[PDB]
Design a binder for these strands. Structure first.
Lengths: 96, 99, 83, 102, 75, 111, 121, 98, 83, 97
DNA sequence: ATCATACTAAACGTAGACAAGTTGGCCTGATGTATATATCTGACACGTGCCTGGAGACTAGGGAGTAATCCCCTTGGCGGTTAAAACGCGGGGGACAGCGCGTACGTGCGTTTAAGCGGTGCTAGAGCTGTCTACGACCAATTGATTCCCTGGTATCAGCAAGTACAGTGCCCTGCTGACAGAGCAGGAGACACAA
DNA sequence: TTGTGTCTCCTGCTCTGTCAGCAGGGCACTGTACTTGCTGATACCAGGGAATCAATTGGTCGTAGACAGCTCTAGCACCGCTTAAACGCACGTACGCGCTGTCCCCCGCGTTTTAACCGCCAAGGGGATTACTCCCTAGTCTCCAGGCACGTGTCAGATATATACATCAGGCCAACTTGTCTACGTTTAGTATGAT
């Protein structure tokens, strides 16, 4: 048999080719980007879990994620991340 | 007869001993509460504060400033001085990572 | 009802006492404005986090637990007010 | 009253030697001179500083400490034995061939 | 041109005649007040002081070289 | 009858990152008993935005260095030059990244 | 069948802290899908031990201060005096705790032989 | 009519431990609150570290082994040793008396 | 098989290079032993945490993930080796 | 006479060279031996993945570089340009180590 | 004939010419870095097979939203007390600047060392799959531990007045020195008065 | 009537008194924190009770993981050769540290202003609790395509070589200032000439 390890490599590459069409990325840089994505996922998810627990709620909704994003990221990053997340959720809700 | 007068630095050490022995809050409560309400006014208007919240804020702020002054006193002494200068606070914050 | 310049309410004797508790013997004259600025920055950060917690709960009163969680987020855990 | 012709060195030597123990301190020297010369009741600071300078300058006097702290408030000065007589034969005013360590 | 810096140094030290010798900073202030481009003549003042000390016209009290305090000679 | 053609939730949200995988990681990460439908979408959007920002800056640095591929040095330069990201990633070490070229003005020769 | 007399899980483990409450908090804290039988016992034992340590040190401090009630000042003294707890609680601030009294050696006055009146240089 | 939710706390257990250590010394309400905060803080630290340990090894159960490793990771040397000894004693006694 | 004095393998030029990358122009002669001590303490802490992680997994090989987790717990998160 | 740079020139050149590079500055084999030696106190007959040793070296060099930056700032604060052990001690004390 | 007085020569004092020391700026060689061009190789990017994990469809039930109510804690106001803050002023000593020096550290060269690379060989141990059994989730009924409230009683703590102990500051005596001034006494020369 | 011995004045060395300053220390006075005692306030503790809610016991059932066995990955050991880095030493300078001096900044203390603190009262805003309900997310089954492993081509970065350019450091020329020597003016000695 052969193993199977998942990662964000293809999605990072898609985003890269969206931003810089003619730029590539080395394997070490791709590993660093995977580590970064995992780290930020962990931070936001943990903060959202703490927010849900503090209010005696058993669900992590988009509101908890929004508050976690505002708590973690600094000012301009927080504002832009909130805008992008709100746009994505609205588009998903309308499209389905 | 001239009145009694302590030399410079003696009453400073007395004050150090007094305020290190004690534990009460050193900032006046009401001005600090007004400051807390002022700063919070920017983030959300017409906020209310539990008295416990203001007391917790004051405790944390005083502890933070006391620790910062310990670090800046060490920084000043490292430069062969006794007077703490603003550059000492700047260095302490820089090494701590706040700047 | 509006608050304007209460940072000056952290008077020179108060900063002097805080320095004295820190073991400072001699204080420069320019420490006080610097200390006011540092305290204002710290208060702004903590209050921003606390008010974010308050808004998430859809409350209007900033509870002590909000301040405790905000401080713990900075890595400045506080004992004595719950948690 | 008239100033005594005796030099301060001779006065100190006589005060030291006149005691039963051949030893006196500055306070006792002051007591002796007050008792035996009413003339010195004036120019007090002048002659006090003069005798202090003479004691600190002349090599014919050497100091000795106090073992159990004594009554205190000042040290004690012993006459140098090697000096012998210097004011003998009536020359109390200007000694010849002063004593010296070197 | 003016007179040589040695004459100004002697004048400065003899002007005040404090019980302790005049310090280097005090002498520099005196020369500046009297009028002199002391900014670019620090080496000139230092070597003049050294020469005067060596010739015996000036006696140094506490410090060494240009440091310390200087006073007028015995005679 | 036959089912409708499957469409990835990322396609609905208009994202590149995986909404399905993010939802699975939320559910199996022991973060809460339940996970809302929009939480994965929001989190994926935020992660995609942050990744796009860092990649933009890293590509700019690489172009400045006259290279076609991004290497860890370029990511380090991008992160530490930008104030916001440097604040976000202040306590992070990037393997094979360097340090920002800077020398204290006191050490420079006295010209 | 008749039920046997109930024994608290703390009583079985010989603890004072609650094994049952700790088990409930572990289950409801969203730490893992399942919680073993011995995990609450181990965690309760550790918490009881740490509490005993801090209370012992704080009571020693209060006794040294001639007080019969432990107050936050005594907790602060106990924490900062012991290096292990201070390392454990380095990033923690105790309300109404104060600070350890210490003055840097260079700040203390320099002894002088002369007893003359102080004057400006 | 209108009740108020009961607030759980470690105050009684802290008091029991204190009277085990110092039979004559008391403790004030503020100190009791501080000790409650400390107990909650250390509880959450150990629980979070145990959860991360379980997640890394792809195990869905937290056992006394995960708690032991968490105690080893968090507390410094002597505290870690004594805590491990106490926990092992407690677990062994519980298993025997069960 | 045994290892006795490998701390001296962090030679003077290596510490000099590390200081140079840090922006140090002039280095005192006593820095090198101090730097060796600091590095030894840091390595001891990180390796202790890594070996604890290895032991919990019942392994005998210290993997890169153990080191990464140890560094993250220390508060020195590392990017480039997975996780 | 042979050419000879004044003190501080080659030091600045080295600073510029090593700040714009990225390769590890400690020799790999001595560091690996040190890592194995330190780990031996905790568990005998341990083994290390090569990537594990590389990660340890990366973290250690990054930590030392940051510490030396803070040490240089401390030295400059004291009106000096040479870093001394007191500077490392002050940086560690303020950091919280 | 003998003296002083003026012209000239040589000693003495002072102003100016000469040569030596110091500083700044420009030119030239050496050296490291930066740039340009050719070669090549292995690390990236793209293509194919597949399999497992995400999407579609449906149901169940309980978590979350909303409305009503209550009473608790926040806000606001008033007045008096006095503790703290603000201001002013004298002056001590500490921060800062300048100079000196000596030795610790930087640069450079020659020799020694072992790190680095490549290749070979072996095997401890990571990593996976398959069994199956003990362990943990879940539910119902029992009950007992934990929380809240009230009462009586107590210990403890806080505040104020009085005495004590410790420590800080500086008077005032005593001791030591540089420098200016002044009495004694040895030795040499002018005046007094004697011997021949 | 004069040479000569002794008396008395003039000279200078030796030693002393004196003005002012600085420094060492015994001990008096002052101030402030600590200790003791008492009074009043309140915060803790113990007992009792009711509420309540959740921990325990007993039983069933599903699957997480301990254990066994196999594959083959990569961690470890060794050897040989090349050469880049480390080490030791020589030499010089510039940087750390000590010392001195000064004068402005902060400390200490007295007096006035002021706003904090306490106690009390009142109103009502919003947090907390309770009941009902509905629709959103977990659970289950089916199915297929998205992402991952493997394989292969090529061109972007690495290496090598050559050439250019910027920078560093030393040497030398030119300008400013000071030490040493020399010539003009003043004054005294030598010789010619006028005065008496």
């Amino acid at each position: 048999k052969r193993s199977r390890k998942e990662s964000y490599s293809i999605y990072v590459y898609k985003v890269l080719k969206q931003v810089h069409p003619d730029t590539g990325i080395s394997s070490k840089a791709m590993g660093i980007m995977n580590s970064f994505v995992n780290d930020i996922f962990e931070r936001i998810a943990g903060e959202a879990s703490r927010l849900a627990h503090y209010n005696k709620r058993s669900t992590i909704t988009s509101r908890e994620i929004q508050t976690a994003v505002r708590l973690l990221l600094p000012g301009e990053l927080a504002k832009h991340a909130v805008s992008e997340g709100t746009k994505a959720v609205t588009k998903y809700t309308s499209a389905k | 007869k001239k009145p009694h007068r302590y030399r410079p630095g003696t009453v400073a050490l007395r004050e150090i001993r007094r305020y290190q022995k004690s534990t009460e809050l050193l900032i006046r409560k009401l001005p600090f509460q007004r400051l807390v309400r002022e700063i919070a006014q920017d983030f959300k208007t017409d906020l209310r504060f539990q008295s416990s919240a203001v007391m917790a804020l004051q405790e944390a702020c005083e502890a933070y400033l006391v620790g910062l002054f310990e670090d800046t006193n060490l920084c000043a002494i490292h430069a062969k001085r006794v007077t703490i200068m603003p550059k000492d606070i700047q260095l302490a914050r820089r090494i701590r990572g706040e700047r | 009802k509006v608050l304007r310049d209460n940072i000056q309410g952290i008077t020179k004797p108060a900063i002097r006492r805080l320095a004295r508790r820190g073991g400072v013997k001699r204080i420069s004259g320019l420490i006080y404005e610097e200390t006011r600025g540092v305290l204002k920055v710290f208060l702004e950060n903590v209050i921003r986090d606390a008010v974010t917690y308050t808004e998430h709960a859809k409350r209007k009163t900033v509870t002590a637990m909000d301040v405790v969680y905000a401080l713990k987020r900075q890595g400045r855990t506080l004992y004595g007010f719950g948690g | 009253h008239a100033k005594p012709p005796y030099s301060y060195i001779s006065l100190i030597t006589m005060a030291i030697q006149q005691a039963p123990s051949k030893m006196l301190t500055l306070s006792e020297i002051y007591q002796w001179i007050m008792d035996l010369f009413p003339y010195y009741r004036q120019n007090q600071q002048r002659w006090q500083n003069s005798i202090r300078h003479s004691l600190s300058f002349n090599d014919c006097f050497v100091k000795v400490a106090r073992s159990p702290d004594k009554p205190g408030k000042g040290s004690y000065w012993t006459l140098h034995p090697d000096s012998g007589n210097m004011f003998e034969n009536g020359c109390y005013l200007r000694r010849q061939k002063r004593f010296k360590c070197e | 041109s003016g007179p040589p810096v040695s004459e100004l140094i002697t004048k400065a030290v003899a002007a005040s005649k404090e019980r302790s010798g005049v310090s280097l900073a005090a002498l520099k202030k005196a020369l500046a007040a009297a009028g002199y481009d002391v900014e670019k003549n620090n080496s000139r003042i230092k070597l003049g002081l050294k020469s005067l000390v060596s010739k015996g016209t000036l006696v140094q009290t506490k410090g060494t070289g240009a440091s310390g305090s200087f006073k007028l000679n015995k005679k | 009858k036959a089912r409708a053609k499957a469409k990835t939730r990322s396609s609905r949200a208009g994202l590149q990152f995986p909404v399905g995988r993010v939802h699975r990681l939320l559910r199996k990460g022991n973060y809460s008993e339940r996970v809302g439908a929009g939480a994965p979408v929001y989190l994926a959007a935020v992660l995609e935005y942050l990744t796009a920002e860092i990649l933009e800056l890293a590509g700019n640095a690489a172009r400045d260095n006259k290279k076609t591929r991004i290497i860890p040095r370029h990511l380090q330069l991008a992160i530490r030059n930008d104030e916001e990201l440097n604040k976000l990633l202040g306590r992070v070490t990037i393997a094979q990244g360097g340090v920002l070229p800077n020398i204290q003005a006191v050490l420079l020769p006295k010209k």
